[PDB]
Design a protein around this nucleic acid. Sequence first.
DNA 1: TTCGGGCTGTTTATAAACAAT
DNA 2: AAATTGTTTATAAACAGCCCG
Lengths: 95, 65
Amino acid sequence: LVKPPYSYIALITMAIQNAPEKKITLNGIYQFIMDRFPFYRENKQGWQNSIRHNLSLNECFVKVPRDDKKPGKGSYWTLDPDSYNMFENGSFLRR
Amino acid sequence: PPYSYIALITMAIQNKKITLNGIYQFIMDRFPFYRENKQGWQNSIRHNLSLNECFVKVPGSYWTL
DNA sequence: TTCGGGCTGTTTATAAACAAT
DNA sequence: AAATTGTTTATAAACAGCCCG
């Protein structure tokens, strides 16, 4: 029960996966993760870096802009449908 | 040398298909920094080929841009 | 022929500079 | 400014496929 055996990609995926509109704000990602996995309630300085790194880097995650600017300071993220259901397994162990 | 690995791999291919060890060589042949040692930065060269869509493996296979 | 180690690749994790908003 | 959010390179490592001695 030290670290959840998920990648950041896994985590971001199930985060987007778990939105009702299937779009989520970066801080919404941070939250979903900490809300559920106690490991990431500390230190959070660093692993939040690597979450942002995985959005920027990975073609599977699609930044779409905010709506009505409420409040703003960050676009929404989604999944390239080519990669929605990439973690077909369901337990997010492989992609 | 103030070049990235991507820079280095690029000018390697630039110099137009090359084998991974051919990359290693072009780099060491020219930049003494990457002569000693050479156990880690070769890792990151391979990492940059796998990772970056700009590099195209055609059939160690050859690499291109 | 099996074993167990070296290269190819590929994928992740972490840390950092650095720009955009 | 002043922080968050994004983009981009690094550096190391976990983990396959091999070809090979």
